[PDB]
Write a protein that binds this ligand. Structure first.
Ligand SMILES: [Cl-]
Length: 248
């Protein structure tokens, strides 16, 4: 309407609404990451709790670590779960025909960020989404250097399809969406937003001007829209709507 009291009431209401919904999308991304981190941490602990004898020959790694990788992979429906060693080999449990985990020598692991970055932090390392060479799907990898008595055993990796996060975000309420660390569109409730030719600059420009969680106005085709974005790890989560709620 027109009376400023009424317009202010509508603006304050929709701000709260849209903020709530943005937070649900933020929570979705957070919970996905923390579930995968907890899992990875539990797997690290089970591997490190084996005696050294079970860890210090490749055959013993196959027979003693392999089943653990397999059970864990199944438990969460991961794509791959694996352990990379300093000799460049990887003990790999992959989705497939029920064949046991095997040692693979062709994964060029000392060139891979999941391997090299795990050795530079004491935390879990989380990759951007990338194309997994084993099963040829886009994954987010959680990796962790495993130590026993201070001694490196190898680098654990857990590959989760990136589509799993995309699908979780898409199911959320609200016209919410998520950009990756390069500010490309990554997930959206409205699948049309994923058209790579769409211009997101008005929303990204408005976020740059306003900051995390700060509700803003912008224009599309000379009509007014409202929205907000916030950082969530290296992602940017946004929500937008028509301003007709406050103007009409
Ligand atoms: Cl994540």
């Amino acid at each position: 309407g027109i009376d400023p009291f009424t317009k202010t009431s509508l603006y304050e209401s929709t701000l709260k609404n849209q903020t709530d919904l943005l937070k649900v999308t933020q929570s979705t991304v957070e919970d996905f990451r923390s579930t995968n981190q907890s899992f990875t941490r539990a797997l690290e602990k089970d591997i490190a709790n084996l005696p050294y004898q079970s860890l210090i020959t490749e055959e013993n790694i196959i027979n003693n670590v392999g089943p653990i990788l397999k059970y864990y992979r199944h438990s969460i429906n991961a794509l791959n779960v694996y352990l990379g060693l300093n000799n460049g080999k990887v003990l790999l449990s992959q989705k497939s025909d029920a064949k046991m985990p095997e040692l693979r020598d062709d994964l060029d692991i000392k060139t891979k960020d999941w391997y090299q970055e795990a050795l530079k932090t004491n935390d879990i390392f989380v990759t951007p989404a990338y194309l997994d060479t084993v099963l040829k799907q886009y994954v987010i990898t959680y990796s962790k250097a495993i130590y026993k008595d201070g001694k490196i055993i190898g680098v654990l990796g857990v590959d989760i399809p990136s589509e799993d996060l995309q699908n979780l975000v898409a199911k959320t309420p609200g016209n919410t969406f998520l950009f990756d660390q390069k500010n490309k569109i990554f997930a959206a409730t409205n699948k049309e937003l994923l058209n790579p030719s769409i211009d997101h600059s008005p929303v990204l420009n408005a976020y740059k001007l306003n900051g995390d969680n700060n509700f803003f106005s912008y224009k599309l085709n000379n009509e007014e829209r409202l929205g907000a974005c916030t950082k969530v790890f290296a992602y940017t989560a946004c929500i937008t709507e028509s301003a007709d709620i406050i103007n009409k």
